[PDB]
Design a protein around this nucleic acid. Structure first.
Lengths: 200, 200, 200, 200
DNA sequence: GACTGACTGACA
DNA sequence: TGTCAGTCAGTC
DNA sequence: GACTGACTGACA
DNA sequence: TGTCAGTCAGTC
């Protein structure tokens, strides 16, 4: 059994997941969590904060998972790295599709809340972000390919693929599990393509 | 002067642009178009249809512009093509930022309307989409790089760059016009990178 | 029959009158005015504005009445003036006890709204206010009695008596009508007392 | 250190002081007193009783202070008396502005509680009240100035000045301390004015 | 037709 | 205490 | 007793 | 989508 608070957060994820911020009611969350609607504003003051706390909760978890990954893989080659990492992200998207579907909702929410969160992210991001800067020094670039330019490309790809598939396979984890294996290939090739394009 | 109907559509774009579907009221559109709120449901029956009509209007325009581009360039090499196209798209995004900002709202709207529109798109898309399929037969691929795989990559890139910058430079057209010229280079490199990666 | 809008304002006066700002519900106003609750926020955006509009409405009226009084009495001696004016104010308080009871509510409402209104008043007040400054030049003061000092005294008395009685005889117009006559005397004496105290 | 109970009462004063009855939450009082919200209804059963207990506490204090003043001054002439008293009251209002600001909230509260308290007051008041009745037999009145009439005037003035300034210099103790000395003169004049007006 | 905007009801 | 898409009665 | 604070329900 | 006075189960 989860503490009422924890069960709110969780229902909030399911609910925001299925409808996104605006379309999602607080009372559905209260029904789904089996709690008094008021309790929600006990813990979270208002809906905006609630979404926020929910999103932090979830990212807390991934960050944890990522940080552990990184250690166990600091040593890998960069692409080899991304290759493997992307794998795990899909494995998560399939083992926790509600969380996945919920993180995607971030764009639906007002300038204010959104920018707030994004900033809280750049912090967490800067780790991985900076690590990549280093593992590129390790590569023999073409004489027209900035490390700056390279980073943008990879960081776009990396997180862009995330949103690219993730809306396409939204509410269809079944269909993802099916297709996972191909995707992983397509990726491996895509990265392989970039490596060949950036190196001498 | 625009017909009252045409001025609704237009205000609807500005409005949906700045708030996205749900947060955007019909009565703001009626204030901003200077019309009776009832008029809106004269012309468009309901808000969903309204967003829809607005989105079609706008895409009618781009498709027209694109189709003309394609003729004047059907002959070019594929990357050379995208290179130059991306250029025009930014030029438009800067000359018509409201339209830009509105097209991006598509993700905020319910399964129903969204899917509808996306389908109406694949239609429009299929032209360019299919043209690319052809200009790739013209290329000497690596022995592990399906035409299928290639197309995904490019089509992702192509429209993914759109969303990548467009949120980053949202409400900052000044800052875009400044940076436009770099971007175009960054792109040319990126495409160059891909060409080198896919070919023998 | 009153326009729905006008009937809201009116019920709002009754209601605020009986409970004051905070304790008073909007839906009671809607019941009492026989209207959709939403219509209220059609016309007045929110409750604060509503109270405000109600208070302006009412003061509009008194100001009108006062301005007419003043003309018909510019010529009187100052006390003779206040004497008579006070009479009329009670005559109003008795002929329109709801309005009376409502104006008193002003103190119950948050710093914001309150200060706003009070300022809108000093404007209207400054007329009477300034007129009094003049009708004192007409008086032979004691050699220790500033016109400044005198004004404060009278302006305090004048409006202070208002609140002094008005809360005491709140919701008791019956009891006021009874007592009106004495009060008018007590006043006449009180003013008479001040005149004797300020003059040589 | 104050007993948790005593610290509730005190925070209740600050809180009711700044927002008045209805706008003031019990949980703010609990935050500001650093206590469990339930504790409040341990000690005071409900919010109405709480305000009440708070108000009595405070008036216990003033009455005590006043009763001591009266002894040390029972002998003085009546105006001389009020003159000097008013002085002390300001001194208190400046040394304890929260208490001041809280006593003024009395009008914001429902018929019931209010009337209750007011009655408990007439009791406390009757002392000073009755003393004044006596010190007026000592005065040679005008042949149209009832002792009754006189008392009203003075009792109004006396406590009316309190409310007159106190709202004007609300949340501005700095500005009061500045002006204190003038006020005291303005008063002395005012009283002087009344003495001259009531006597032969 | 186009056009209005006061008005509602069910919902946060 | 707000919030909004949609309707409705009716003018032009 | 004192003390807590998560929790509710009816209400804006 | 908030708002709040009051309760309730239970520790110390």
């Amino acid at each position: 059994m989860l503490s009422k608070r924890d069960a709110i957060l969780k229902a909030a994820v399911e609910v925001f997941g299925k409808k996104g911020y605006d379309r999602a009611t607080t009372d559905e969350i209260a029904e789904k969590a089996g709690v008094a609607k008021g309790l929600i504003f006990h813990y979270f003051k208002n809906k905006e904060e609630l979404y926020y706390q929910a999103y932090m909760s979830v990212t807390e978890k991934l960050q944890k998972e990522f940080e552990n990954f990184l250690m166990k893989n600091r040593n890998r080659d960069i692409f080899d790295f991304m290759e493997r990492w992307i794998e795990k992200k899909l494995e998560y998207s399939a083992s926790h599709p509600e969380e996945a579907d919920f993180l995607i909702t971030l764009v639906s929410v007002d300038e204010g809340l959104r920018k707030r969160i994004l900033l809280d992210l750049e912090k967490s991001q800067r780790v991985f972000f900076d690590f990549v800067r280093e593992k590129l020094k390790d590569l023999d670039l073409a004489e027209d390919v900035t490390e700056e330019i390279a980073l943008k490309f990879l960081m776009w790809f990396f997180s862009g693929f995330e949103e690219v598939y993730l809306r396409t396979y939204q509410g269809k984890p079944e269909l993802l599990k099916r297709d996972m294996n191909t995707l992983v290939e397509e990726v491996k090739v895509m990265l392989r393509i970039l490596k060949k394009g950036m190196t001498k």
